[PDB]
């Protein structure tokens, strides 16, 4: 990155795991092991992640044969920013214009992540990894 | 915070120091000690910072007597993004939609930081830290 943005492991794995659940939402519950396998995630880390997402009401556990985990809301009702919000935790006043610049950076990030839902990601996933007859590439 | 964005020490101090130089551009060179004092920065850290900014052509040293450091370009020709860029430094393909989301985040940050110059910051500084008759609020 030119601006040197670094994404935390928790953000990256949180979104990856939620997206994997979105990809399986219609078909039903999947095991955590299967998510870890498809996404190249460590199972212990994923276990801890899912625990928080579950407390937040973003994912739920089911007791079936195909038991396992499913999204607790439809992908269209989960913004990427919602996932990030869940995972994240002598005096005098002197205004800092520099801090105001960072506030503007923060606001723009919040705007992007609130503008994308898991359903949007599902749509993009379909368009970008598809295959077609060559004459249809424009 | 909300998204939990954290700004590095180097970005924060890099921009603070460059802005302090912008605030003194017309008046001329200032010492690094003076910058460290006004901005609450560690002198050793600032000296290392300034060395890179100098190599990049963003600041220059002047011999003088009351010499010191000044911006090497006018504040209107230095984007905050320019400062950040200076300071920063088998096989198979599988598209990641999650990575594409972060690419979009990166783009928007780049756009904000390229849209603000040190001159814009000088104007904002004036406006926000002013004093006037109360009837004009």
């Amino acid at each position: 990155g030119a601006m040197g943005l670094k994404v935390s492991t928790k953000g990256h794995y949180g979104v990856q795991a939620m997206f994997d659940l979105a990809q399986h939402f219609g078909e039903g519950p999947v095991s955590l092991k299967s998510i870890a396998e498809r996404q190249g995630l460590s199972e212990p880390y994923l276990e801890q992640l899912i625990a928080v997402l579950r407390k937040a009401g973003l994912v739920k556990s089911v007791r079936g044969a195909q038991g396992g985990y499913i999204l607790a809301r439809e992908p269209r009702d989960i913004k990427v920013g919602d996932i990030i919000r869940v995972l994240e935790g002598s005096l005098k006043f002197d205004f800092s214009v520099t801090k105001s610049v960072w506030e503007k950076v923060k606001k723009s990030i919040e705007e992007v992540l609130d503008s994308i839902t898991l359903a949007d990601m599902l749509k993009d996933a379909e368009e970008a990894q598809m295959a077609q007859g060559y004459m249809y590439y424009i | 915070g909300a998204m939990g964005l954290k700004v590095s020490t180097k970005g924060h101090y890099g921009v603070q120091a460059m802005f302090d130089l912008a605030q003194h551009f017309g008046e001329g060179p200032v010492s690094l000690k003076s910058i460290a004092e006004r901005q609450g920065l560690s002198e050793p850290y600032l000296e290392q910072l300034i060395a890179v900014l100098r190599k990049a052509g963003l600041v220059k040293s002047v011999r003088g007597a009351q010499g010191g450091y000044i911006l090497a370009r006018e504040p209107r020709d230095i984007k905050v993004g320019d400062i950040i860029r200076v300071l920063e430094g088998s096989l198979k393909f599988d598209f990641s939609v999650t990575k594409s989301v972060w690419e979009k985040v990166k783009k928007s940050i780049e756009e904000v930081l390229d849209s603000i110059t040190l001159a814009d910051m000088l104007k904002d500084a004036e406006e926000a830290q002013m004093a006037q008759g109360y009837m004009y609020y």
């Binding site: 994240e88 | 939990g4 920063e88």
Partner: peptide, 6 residues
């Protein structure tokens, strides 16, 4: 600590 710059 979700994202940092730079």
């Amino acid at each position: 600590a979700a994202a940092a710059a730079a």
